[PDB]
Amino acid sequence: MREIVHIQGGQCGNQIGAKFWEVVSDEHGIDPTGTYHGDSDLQLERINVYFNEATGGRYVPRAILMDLEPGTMDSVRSGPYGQIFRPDNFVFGQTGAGNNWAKGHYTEGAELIDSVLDVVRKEAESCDCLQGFQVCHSLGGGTGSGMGTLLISKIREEYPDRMMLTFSVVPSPKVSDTVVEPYNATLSVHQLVENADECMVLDNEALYDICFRTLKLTTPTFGDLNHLISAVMSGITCCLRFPGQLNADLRKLAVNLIPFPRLHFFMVGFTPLTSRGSQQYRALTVPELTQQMWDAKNMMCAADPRHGRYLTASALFRGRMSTKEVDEQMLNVQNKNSSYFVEWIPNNVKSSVCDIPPKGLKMSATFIGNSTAIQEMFKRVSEQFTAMFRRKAFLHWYTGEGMDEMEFTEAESNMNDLVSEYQQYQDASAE
């Protein structure tokens, strides 16, 4: 019935989606070849949200990979669960953006976007009732940021009522791959704030910190960060795909977390996450889940929410759980540590329950907080953007392409006014 169309942009986007589709296929029990071989019949009734029956139990995902160089597509094909994507959905150029947002938004976009729009429209009308689109991408690279952003804009022009999720990774200066990360991210966010329905801000800094501290893995390579992000996405969308005692779709979560149309940048967290040597010692209760959900070191954004106020928050639980305990944990975490919750919105915590656990567990939870500590990361980006734009460094790479300086000026102005609006919604009075 309700349909989620998945879109992946760029190399990080492609690999995030690879792990995500692995997890989803494993959850629904389809084999790496692409045929159903599960046991319980709860798995068949809600795979229309993600797949399409081809021939005798053959389900292919409702996904659109998009890139600019065939290396990513071939790395997708080579991996397990790599033969289930339909080759028609492999749209890809041959030049490569090369960490150039201008190249991703004006030169190659102008002639790749129409083909990718054809593909996305075909896979959108291949189903009956869209829930929405779900795009995964980065804000550092070019072929993901610029191309995916132009795609988002065109999609919001075409289909203005269906929902839109953007799982975006943002750069943060402690781990800085590229040099033009602010030039990319500022323009991308300036476009997001008027196109995207809601955004979840991930960060490799936070992912690495979590894998070091909580999991205590020795070598936490990008595979494990991708698995964490995929766990987050599956915990987001579990409500559609499995029945429960209190369901909550993407539109429901958006309407309960977004109090104003421009305030849609959330920080995410997942529970439980512990080492295999430390899983022997810990207890396993809903309080044990919530103490780790609300812990500030568990947020997948590199921003301490203790430095600001929670505007709204949402929790999605998976597993057979007692709604009494769910409600009272939420109640006490709201009441006790009460300074971190805003005043002019009482009962800030939306919650939902589903009875099917993620693969490998008995109970789990996903937290989505719309806080006002995200203006911290926005300021950290804008300050580097100012530092560069003062001296006009790296500017020719964009200016010799069709872009002008007023684009940068407008991006700066929008970023600054957004952080101002976040600041004064934090510092608003009750009456």
């Binding site: 150029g93 041959q94 009308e125």
Partner: protein
Amino acid sequence: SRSYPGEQVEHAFNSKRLKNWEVPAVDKSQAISTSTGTRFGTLQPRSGRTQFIVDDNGHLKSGVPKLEKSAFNFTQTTPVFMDSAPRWPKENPTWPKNMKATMGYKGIQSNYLPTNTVTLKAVEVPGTTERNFNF
């Protein structure tokens, strides 16, 4: 159409007794102009012959007045109870929706066969118009 008093059986033809259970039609029952005014009553006697109101083939003569467009119930002036369920081809949350088919998009229009992929060029000047199609 009007429902006349039966004087013996209307006690059994009360709408509530017929499992109607809604607010019944009393339009049909006021148009009678009975003596008492209620459904229990006696009609008025009539005398004479009825002249022809209508012309031939059912068209009202010019002199007699009529309601302007009374054969139909327009949506602006209909009440709320006279509303119908939507039929099939209109989309409704109840019955499933078959897919739609959308005009595709031929590839990037070049001087050779259009494709869905852009290539690296060896020569790039703003006015290059110079390609390498064979692979």
